Symmetry: C5
């Protein structure tokens, strides 16, 4: 009930979704030769860890449970959204300090750069629509989970729905709070050895900036997320 | 039993099956060098997402639960009764598919994997409009046999695990084998037509093809060459399982 | 009873055919893949069929013989445990054949540039080239697995238990090329049908001719596979029945 | 109780473990191109079927349930009691494995995949007879640690799902890693000797080898270089866990 | 509660985690041509066996159950109470790991796959002593976060499937990602040091390398460049979660 509690559980959820994207990046590092959809699918299955963490442990992931809230019957969102952000950024910091970006001869870092960079090149509408698509999947996953009895039920019913949105490259704003900043940090602070390893340079990723993150992704994706969850809320009421 | 509620649940199921096909397209994108059956099997496993969604969330997928209706009524119903909501669920389902088509087109998703995502839809849609009426009805009955069986098995489950994961194999079987489900095609084929009709020139370049390569992808061909025979096959397929179940 | 049984037998023939269709789809185009891996996957898909039989209460020839012995409690005779075997066997056959017609009508055989169809031909053909004794032993092997799978399934207390306990034992027999008579009622005839009806196009895409599969005939199916395999399946069941009987008494 | 019941159940487990190894051979046939550990892992997963059969159906696999026995008695039990049926089970296990060797030979399975199935058996059996005595013991210790742990975990299960699938990882681990289980080897190595001695000229031509290339595969080598030291290790590994169990139960 | 029992269970957890890393080495042997991430993920999934063993059999793995201890007192316990038997458990853990090093060494396993199994250990171990101190601490924080969370989730489970399988993903995650767990490293790094110091000439030949290419693989480099910083990190990782847990519980 405490707003402090919620804030701590939202930070926790931010850390959890970062764990998920880290797993995704790890799983998909060096998979450029493998068929696109298969590599992404495996990445997405791995990503589901994060949602499983949130549900089993009771963390508060921005809007993920909106259908639960309606079923058992709201500016708390600002609290959760920002707590989420704080947790993601703390994990960005921890991941940077661990040296992980040099994993697989720097390919781990490159995977983050290219994944982060992809995410700031949508138009506003497609970003919104991918935000809609992503949260539809998350909210549905969380809903199914709640009809679950056992741990197995609650965790594993969420694997397919999550893997689908992730493998499909749909956009989740909180997940993005880890990924794009992680990309920005690497782009700005990577050693010369990393660039040599990876056959690239900072200027090849010139759109990976804070500004571009906020405007080309975070805003439209957050809007899209909100709409996605809203569509489900509004479908729920009629029923 | 409210007519408008099932309409919303039908629209929901349409979105659910569209989600299934999108997932299928995603998983099978760029699988060209992969053994045909292996790629198709994995796509089929992913596709099961849609039926898991339908059943667990309580959505209304055209005829998928017909076997249940019988046993629930302890065997008390007639022809003219078992299809009151049928055109209701059907067109509702269609709206769901079409809506998700619009949304998927707006997402710019067809440019995924250098346009290979889009190309996958083109080819998948294209394949579904080159069937003989007969073989489409047959693929149609084969598909619905698998869906109805999957749904009947689900209903004997207790846990969430039971209800969901018993449907994976039978669903994945019909999808990997390229059997025909009318509603799922309401997304796939119009998705292909939209892409064909409205794809940028850069897509065509990236992929290395042309709109003239998919000259059979028209709205009319969709209706007459697929939707009609497949729907009829879906119906006969569900027909058989009903007659068998009855005598029990 | 007998009429209800017959239909549940047709049902199982349908189910077992679905199993093999899935197997063929899964293994189509897997010539570059390691043999065992491709076959293992096909066998996991094939398990659908038995899952279908057990969960929907369908009647697959002899598959439950162990459950019946257990239910009798050792108060049963071998002479009673075979009245409706011929009924089930025949019903299974009808269902398998009906599915052969449905698969042929679908034109499914052209899938993957004729490769699906070719899969069936090569699979069917291989099944008609055993020695009689090879066929019998392969039949013993397949039915040990089927009977064990079904037996484990019956100790289950959820859908998950009953269905998934069978995946491994079924995959093992299918992946291993063991011989199950009912499954064969679909595969070999499906192959005979494709061979004697395939279009010139199929043969061109496939790169073969009907004369490459000269052993695929109804009579060769009956004598070189079905008889010995059926005998084998029966013996495989008998061994387990005999074993169970001793452990009980 | 009753030596005869136990004997038949042991025959059954010997068949069960033979089924396990057949599945492993089938799954790993033609996996020369695959990464080694990946092929071995998949075979190991397939192999667990054998232990699943033994536990679910109630068969008696040499020493596999020794920790259950100790726990059910609350450690109020002597080694003589623990080992009371070992000779009988070991023998019965052997009879079941040899019966399965015969059936597999009569099946003609060795020609599967143009003889590669049979070749896989030969190479697998041959590898198992080239250990030093100490290596074979330690590999035996390792194998039976895993089997007994697997069976231990299975007994805390409350559903068929629990009991079966909890053994997958620990069995796959011992198998993928090439640890040595004596009963499993009663199928595998004699299967090798049999193929080596009775394979057709067509087989040898198909796989491009000759019986001369597998001259270590004899009954006496099987017994002295594998079965004896592996059986010793198996017992030692079970023993180590039994010791551990006694003590953890003793410490009130 | 008994100290000697705890010690035996800590030796046991050391064995279980050693088993986990052996399985990881087995599955990833010869995987150099697979996508890096796929191979490590598979390895990581195999690795989860170790933790499944610890939880199912009630062995004591350094700090892994710290969150559960906090929950069982509704957060009404002190830091000093939490670390009460950390020394006992840490040393038991170590004894168990080292024992399994000795056994794996005597098994001759390092020659598996033409020495590739042993090469896999060398390179894995060697990697683990080339972090900066800060990196090793952070990698240690990261590994123990995932371990403590997995165990926490496992404790809300009711069936055996629940308790075991809920742990697969978070364990594979830390392992596939190359995060650093101190007890696991008590097997891995000493295993590499042993292979380096005692490998036959046949090994280095089959493997195309030499001991001088692994000059950092020493007991001292193990302690100072990995064990100390990684252990500190493991502790900080558990500490973070325990602190979060107090507050969640201290706010209704
Ligand atoms: O010497 C006769 C003894 O017979 C039984 O003990 C057997 C017991 O039944 C028998 O299973 C056991 O076998 C020894 C271990 C096996 C294990 C496989 C390899 C061959 C040897 O050896 C014991 C000692 O002979 C009785 O239980 C003993 O009380 C009795 O003293």
């Amino acid at each position: 009930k405490h707003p402090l509690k919620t804030f701590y559980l939202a930070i926790t959820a931010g850390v959890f979704i970062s764990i998920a994207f880290v797993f995704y990046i790890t799983a998909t590092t060096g998979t450029g030769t493998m068929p696109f959809g298969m590599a992404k699918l495996v990445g997405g299955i791995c990503f589901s860890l994060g949602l499983i963490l949130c549900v089993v442990c009771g963390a508060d992931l921005f809007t993920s449970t909106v259908l639960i809230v309606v079923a058992k019957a709201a500016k708390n969102w600002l609290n959760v959204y920002f707590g989420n952000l704080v947790g993601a950024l703390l994990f960005v910091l921890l991941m940077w300090l661990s040296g992980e970006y040099m994993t697989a001869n720097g390919q781990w870092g490159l995977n983050v750069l290219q994944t982060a960079d992809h995410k700031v090149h949508h138009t506003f509408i497609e970003a919104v629509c991918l935000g809609i698509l992503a949260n539809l999947m998350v909210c549905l996953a969380v809903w199914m989970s709640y009809s679950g009895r056992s741990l197995m039920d609650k965790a594993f019913i969420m694997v397919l729905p999550v893997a689908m949105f992730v493998a499909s490259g749909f956009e989740h704003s909180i997940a993005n709070m880890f990924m794009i900043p992680m990309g920005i940090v690497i782009r700005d602070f990577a050693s010369p050895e990393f660039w040599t390893a990876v056959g690239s340079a900072p200027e090849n990723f010139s759109h990976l900036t804070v500004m571009n993150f906020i405007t080309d992704n975070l805003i439209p994706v957050t809007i899209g997320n909100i709409i996605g969850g809203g569509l489900l809320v509004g479908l729920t009421y009629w029923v």
